[PDB]
Design a protein around this ligand. Structure first.
Ligand code: CL
Ligand code: CL
Ligand code: NA
Length: 129
C-alpha cells in the first residue's frame, strides 16, 4: 500500500506514535517519506547482506527474521515480511522498540539526514487529525 501523507499521519497517531519518546508526529511522517516514499512494500538490501523492510525500513540484522541474514537477531520477534503489510501495526510496534533503545530516531539515517532539525510539523500541516 502507498499511503497518502495525511492518511499515514492519522494512522500513526491512532497507533500511539505522536510524541512517542518525545518525537512529534511530523518526525515519524518525515522519516517514512524519505525511508520508503510511504510504500509499505519497500525493500532495500544493505552491503552487509541484511535487508531493510517496510514503511520505516526496519533492518533484518537486528529487528526481524528474514531467514537469510546469518547471525542476525530478531529483537522485534517477527518475520520481516510482516513489516510489508498494508496494516502498519507490526512496523509501528517494532519502531517503538527501536526508538526506545537509547539512540532515539537517529537509528533512521534518512531522519538524521533529512528530517532532524527541519520544520517537521510541515509534514502534518493541513491534515485532519
Ligand atoms: Cl509535528
Ligand atoms: Cl540519507
Ligand atoms: Na534478523
Amino acid at each position: 500500500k502507498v499511503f497518502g501523507r495525511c492518511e499515514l499521519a492519522a494512522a500513526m497517531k491512532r497507533h500511539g506514535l505522536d510524541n512517542y519518546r518525545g518525537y512529534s508526529l511530523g518526525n515519524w511522517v518525515c522519516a517514512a517519506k524519505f525511508e520508503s516514499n510511504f510504500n509499505t512494500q519497500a525493500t532495500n538490501r544493505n552491503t552487509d547482506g541484511s535487508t531493510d523492510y517496510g514503511i520505516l525500513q526496519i533492518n533484518s540484522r537486528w529487528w526481524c527474521n528474514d531467514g537469510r541474514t546469518p547471525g542476525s537477531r530478531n529483537l522485534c520477534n517477527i518475520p520481516c515480511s510482516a513489516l510489508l503489510s498494508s496494516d502498519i501495526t507490526a512496523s509501528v510496534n517494532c519502531a517503538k522498540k527501536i526508538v526506545s533503545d537509547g539512540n532515539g530516531m537517529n537509528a533512521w539515517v534518512a531522519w538524521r539526514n533529512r528530517c532532524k532539525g527541519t520544520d517537521v510539523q510541515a509534514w502534518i500541516r493541513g491534515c485532519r487529525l
